[PDB]
Amino acid sequence: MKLEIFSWWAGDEGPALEALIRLYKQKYPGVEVINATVTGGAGVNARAVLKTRMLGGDPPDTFQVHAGMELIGTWVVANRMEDLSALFRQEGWLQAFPKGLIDLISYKGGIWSVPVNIHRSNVMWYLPAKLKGWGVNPPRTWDKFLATCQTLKQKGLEAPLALGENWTQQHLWESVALAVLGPDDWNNLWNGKLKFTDPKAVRAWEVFGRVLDCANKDAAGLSWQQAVDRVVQGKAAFNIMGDWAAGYMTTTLKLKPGTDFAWAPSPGTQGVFMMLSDSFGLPKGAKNRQNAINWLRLVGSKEGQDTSNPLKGSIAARLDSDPSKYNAYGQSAMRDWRSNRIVGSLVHGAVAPESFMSQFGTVMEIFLQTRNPQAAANAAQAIADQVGLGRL
Numbered sequence: 001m002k003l004e005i006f007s008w009w010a011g012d013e014g015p016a017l018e019a020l021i022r023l024y025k026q027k028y029p030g031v032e033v034i035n036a037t038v039t040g041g042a043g044v045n046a047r048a049v050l051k052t053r054m055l056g057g058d059p060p061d062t063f064q065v066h067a068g069m070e071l072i073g074t075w076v077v078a079n080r081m082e083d084l085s086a087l088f089r090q091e092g093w094l095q096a097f098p099k100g101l102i103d104l105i106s107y108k109g110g111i112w113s114v115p116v117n118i119h120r121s122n123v124m125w126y127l128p129a130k131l132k133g134w135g136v137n138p139p140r141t142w143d144k145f146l147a148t149c150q151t152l153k154q155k156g157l158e159a160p161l162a163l164g165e166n167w168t169q170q171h172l173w174e175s176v177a178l179a180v181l182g183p184d185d186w187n188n189l190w191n192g193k194l195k196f197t198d199p200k201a202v203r204a205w206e207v208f209g210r211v212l213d214c215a216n217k218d219a220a221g222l223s224w225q226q227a228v229d230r231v232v233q234g235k236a237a238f239n240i241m242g243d244w245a246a247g248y249m250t251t252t253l254k255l256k257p258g259t260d261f262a263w264a265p266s267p268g269t270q271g272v273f274m275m276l277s278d279s280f281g282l283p284k285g286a287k288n289r290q291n292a293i294n295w296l297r298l299v300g301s302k303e304g305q306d307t308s309n310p311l312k313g314s315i316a317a318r319l320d321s322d323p324s325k326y327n328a329y330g331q332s333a334m335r336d337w338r339s340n341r342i343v344g345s346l347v348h349g350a351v352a353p354e355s356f357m358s359q360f361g362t363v364m365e366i367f368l369q370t371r372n373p374q375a376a377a378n379a380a381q382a383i384a385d386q387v388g389l390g391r392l
């Protein structure tokens, strides 16, 4: 009796998953659970290893996968995933999750994964005590951000923005783009109505370039946790990162939300929640099909999601989640989830296929070397053209 769970929740990202695994082992003491993590922020490495396994005919029993185009445009269109519609009916999930989320996991009459959470991409983290020590406010626009960072450089803070490795630069970029375009034109990139070479979209890269000039010069070789650490250490003022950062700061670092650190929407994005969702499906050919199905039932449940997510920093996908189980960050994100305009993340798989996502890092590499907005814009457009962005 075995169950192999594939994810990128390694190291200090593992607490929430480990909690779910203990829960599963209580309910199913016969099953030896293989925690098959591929170490690497945002699943860049996991994606590559999964590809080797899936194409090799050796699927895991289930794998972490983002709801939306990431899920659909890779293993679903390849006809390698089981349709979960029957299970959704059995569990009452169609009424348990918001319709917008159901839509992301639905394609050609089937439902293809089970959401465990909602993360938000567009969060700016800072230490409200360090900001007072520097006598600045948390910036609500990119102009105020750029002006505040200049003040901080003047006051001796060399790199007021914390930044890490390539994907985290893309992560920053999607917040900047959302701010510059607004939610509708952000959405228009992904349906192909707005070209990346439109002056409106080129400007995303202009604003992004200036933001990049407030960042640490050693960013390329740092993990997302190391970039958060810079803020906690006061070697930076700000970091734009998903709310797994809140999980890191509370679960791992034992910091108190609101007093030891605070949060705001990414500058220029207040009122918009850029979402993503970690989900699990059922691969065809899974060696342990029933055990995996039982894992899906747990991750789709209120008991599972309200055990795991408070540790993670994400909120539950389930509408019936109990807010009393969440700290001050969790409860804030819960509120914004219900009230804000919702758009999806690029970097975390909601809005574009892996064909595009995987090549966006190359685009970002070339912006880092050229710092030419038009070149980057042109590169994103060529990629979109080559993959047929919008066809799914």
Ligand SMILES: OC[C@H]1O[C@H](O)[C@H](O)[C@@H](O)[C@@H]1O
Pocket: 008, 013, 040, 041, 042, 043, 119, 224, 242, 244, 276, 277, 278, 347, 348
């Ligand atoms: O690795 C950092 C984060 O990246 C991913 O995009 C996941 O959706 C999230 O679960 C994870 O914490």
